[model samples]
Target: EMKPHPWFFGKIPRAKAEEMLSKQRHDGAFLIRESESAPGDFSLSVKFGNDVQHFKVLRDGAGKYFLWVVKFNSLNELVDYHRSTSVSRNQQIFLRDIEQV
Candidate 1:
């Protein structure tokens, strides 16, 4: 059986995730939450510099997850890679500490 995702805060409000992430006060802290702007969509909230940036996570009909570019078999797959590797080309951001419920 598969394990539950500790980093995922399902159906959480944007303000709530923002409030939680703001407490970190450090870059690279991230969490996954359902999008408030787009219902049923997953959003990745990461702390960078002084603010948190939200990115959309897409799911294909085959049940694979993507950062809108690369496809991952599971959400953890995405997190694991980005944890060590930078997600952006010009940015030094990486998924460091995960905000869990």
Candidate 2:
């Protein structure tokens, strides 16, 4: 089963996440920084190719974690599928992210 914030990972462990922050470099691994808005809450860091990708996330209080997303096919077709007919407010954009290897 997946853990909280950064749910997808064959990557870092929760146990070592904070430790790695102290010991490793910024881009070395996945990162989670304490949320400024919500003191105890956190946000996972993701890089797009060499840039940053931004998205909004909500906490699943009942599940006791951050909610994950469902990937949709055909981003082009789905893009701007809003208004007039009311396009979706949320859209996921992908980028050529470099793996930390």
Candidate 3:
């Protein structure tokens, strides 16, 4: 868990964040949610195309957040694919932010 800045609930500069969100909201994707585990954190997401990007934001941890973003072709596949014994479990997740997520 991360402690957030006392006032700012955004991850990026106000103008930049708003600009990005505005674009996504008009073109398609945006959502706001109070995080279940991280109080004072703002959960934000944006989509640019077929794949949407997600953010678990805080005042909002400027450069501390980086991890794998998952995408699945299907739920049936994911169920079978999360296997530890299945070699790759079909291995469809994208750790694009890797080698360290």
Candidate 4:
């Protein structure tokens, strides 16, 4: 029930994430996968050009979520904000279309 959006690919691994995003139809195509290293945490897998970039989504003690600097009240809130904004400063890693399942 947590995955109300198509962007969330729960419990998927890194290799599977890369493979799914390998044929991105547009720039900024991405998906959210559960972290393999940490349960209850998440990872953002964004398709940048020919490669896929993975960013860790950490949770605070208060149950808030964030990638690094900015914090969100919920997981979906984080994803929604980054849709129009770049996740990284050096690169224009925005989350555009969600990868089809």
Query: Candidates' TM-scores?
Result: 0.81, 0.33, 0.28, 0.87
In angstroms, the error of model 2 at 10 is: 21
Tell me the deviation in Å of residue 12 in model 1: 1.3
Q: Between the candidate structures 2 and 3, which one is better when assessed by lDDT?
A: 3
Model 2 alpha-carbon drift over 4 Å, by segment = 1-29, 54-57, 69-101
Task: Write the number of the candidate with greater lDDT, choosing between 1 and 4.
Answer: 4
What are the per-residue Cα lDDT tens digits for candidate 3 across 60-88?
Answer: 13433222334344322322332222212
Q: Pick by TM-score: which candidate is best?
A: 4
lDDT of 2 by residue, 1-101 (tens): 86342323323444444443344333323344445555555554433234433222344535333324432232222221211121113433322212343
lDDT of each candidate versus the true structure: 0.81, 0.34, 0.36, 0.84
- Model 2 pairs whose backbones collide: 81-87, 82-86, 82-87, 83-86, 83-87
Between candidates 2 and 3, which one is better according to TM-score?
2
CA lDDT of 88 in candidate 2?
18
Q: What is the lDDT of candidate 4?
A: 0.84
**Alpha carbon deviation, residue 23, candidate 4 (Å):** 0.8
Model 1, range 1-101, lDDT digits (tens) per residue? 88876677888998988888888866888888888789877888888877888778888899888884778997788888888777666687888766454
Instruction: TM-score winner between 2 and 4, please give it.
Output: 4
